[PDB]
Design a protein that fits this description.
This is part of a larger assembly, with chains A, B and C. Chain A is mostly helical. Chain A is built from five helices and three strands, in the order H-H-H-H-E-E-E-H. Chain A has a three-stranded antiparallel sheet, with helices on one face. The longest helix of chain A has 25 residues. The radius of gyration of chain A is 15 Å and the shape is globular. Chain B is mainly beta. Chain B contains two helices and 30 strands. The two termini of chain B are 13 Å apart. Chain C is α+β, with helices and mostly antiparallel strands. Chain C is globular, with a radius of gyration of 19 Å. The chains are: A mainly alpha, B mainly beta, C alpha+beta. At the A-B interface, helix 5 of A face strand 1 of B. Chain A: Component of the VPS34 PI3-kinase complex II composed of VPS15, VPS30, VPS34 and VPS38. Chain A: This is Vacuolar protein sorting-associated protein 38. Chain A: It is found in: Golgi apparatus, trans-Golgi network membrane; Endosome membrane.
Chain lengths: 120, 383, 199
Amino acid sequence: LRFKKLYQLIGIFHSTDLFNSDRGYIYLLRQAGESTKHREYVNSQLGYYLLFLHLTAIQIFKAPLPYRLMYYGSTSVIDSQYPLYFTDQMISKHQAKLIKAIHYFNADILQFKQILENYR
Amino acid sequence: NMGNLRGKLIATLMENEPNSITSSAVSPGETPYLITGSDQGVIKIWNLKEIIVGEVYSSSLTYDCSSTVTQITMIPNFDAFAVSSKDGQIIVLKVNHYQQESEVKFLNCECIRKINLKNFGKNEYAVRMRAFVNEEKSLLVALTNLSRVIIFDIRTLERLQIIENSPRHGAVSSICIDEECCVLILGTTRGIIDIWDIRFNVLIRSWSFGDHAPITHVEVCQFYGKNSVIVVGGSSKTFLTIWNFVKGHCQYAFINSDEQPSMEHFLPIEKGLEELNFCGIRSLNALSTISVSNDKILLTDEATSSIVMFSLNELSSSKAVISPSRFSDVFIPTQVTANLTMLLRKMKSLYHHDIINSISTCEVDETPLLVACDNSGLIGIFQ
Amino acid sequence: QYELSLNQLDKLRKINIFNATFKISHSGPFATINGLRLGSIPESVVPWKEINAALGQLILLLATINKNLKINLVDYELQPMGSFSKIKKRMVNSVEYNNSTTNAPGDWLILPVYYDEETKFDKSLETTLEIISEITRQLSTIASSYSELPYIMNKDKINGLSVKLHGSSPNLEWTTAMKFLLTNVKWLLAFSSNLLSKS
């Protein structure tokens, strides 16, 4: 219950950490490709800044995660072999970012399952 | 051989937090079917490939036993999954699945046959269960609550014969079947080893050794053949004692210690009798789990709380899958006796998990990997 | 299970530090923020987008501070996004032009503190230092409400170090300046922790 309330305060910390991400959340590939142009390429990496909050959730929960994650902010290191944010870097970089998207998605689902495993 | 791989854990999933799984088994094939029971009497089934790619983490299939389950095993060369429950409920569920959109999915789980173990009349709960199917004929064998060996014919769902271990041996410390399956290999809570011939319906031999403590597990190794058996138990320091049945000696004994054991103490105990008073160990390093296949023998070490792997090809190259953060252990064997060899292990933290009550080795048809279920009701996979 | 409980106790002792996320420590000659290296020396330079991401994290820290203390920003407006940090400083122009009424709404000349994507980064830096001074001001007011000047900085030069980029490449100047500035920022962060604890 203690660490839960601390995770609530950290939740408020994420709410106060919410600037670039407000209306949207973590739950999309075609959406990324479509919104890539309309986001000016700012809100793209700024949308990839969620890896910082994810890593924050990680270190707080101290629970092992399916995908290796390191949050560099704008361009974040996933497994060290893949970029978290392509930001329209290249054509092959879109494929690397695709595999990285599948990765982060899998880690998101697994983490969501870990959160669904919560009990008293 | 899967022992050479790094074996990093790519998944952590727990469906039921509340209780540990009493049994864990996997249905082999192109697309492995994961299965684990529950102490609350629940049957859970997960999809290998689905957990590998999409990483979806939930029960793909759920069956309600309504009563606590004892153990489970997958019928050889079959899609049927056999299970026994401490309510005295023995049943086998047939698998139903389909293939569409270049993938596979599961349909429904239904029990093919239902046989009450409560029909014995003494109301005994099934302890351990091992089933087998020979091209000749198919059958199953189980241990009663009083640790009595009972072999029921899988065909007629009836009892073929009933074997009973001597009360001087205490209870049954393990369950194993011979290569010809005409003989049963069972350990003793008294810290004895007993192999019996079902052919003539008698007890072939009774063996003992080491500190004469309880035997953790007993099984027939592959590379060691039917002429040699692997038994975890006996002497404290010794992790696993492998002894050749006919030879009457222990060929290879894997022990955790900084020194070589005593030759007179490691010698086979025969002349000893039932008068021995049982002496066990309450230490946390006692209870563990082990699974051995394809020349590789995997053993979960509760001592340092780490997964260890001993390759039968080379105990030298043998090492631990998952270990602590600071350093790992260096292991190497030697031989004092011409007929006996001994392996030594010399010792030199983000992951958090309880003791492992169950473990299973598997292949993804792409790359090999291992699955494990702990006492906290959590499951994980390492590739 | 008990071992897991003790691990949770240590995790609680670490959870007392939960206020620190973007927090900056010192590594090598320079100081890095939340695992992001800032500043570049004559030997090993860092990436531009890395410095941009670190500055975005610093601006995110400033925004988090403004959100936490709920303090009003007179001449400043905060829009951090990813690496790119938009800081809008409302100020008067030369006002020598008689054709400009300037009686209505307006905006800052250059919002962005991000570069490489005379130097606007220098102006944003001086404005950041002034924002730190005003931060210490409002914080002094909060201290007077509840009822400490280690930082010596001038708009041109902070603690003797040059805070101006001048359109040139990275050097020891901006490195030492970033050092002292990040250290003082860490001190101000500790002060923010003390205030959040006292409120």
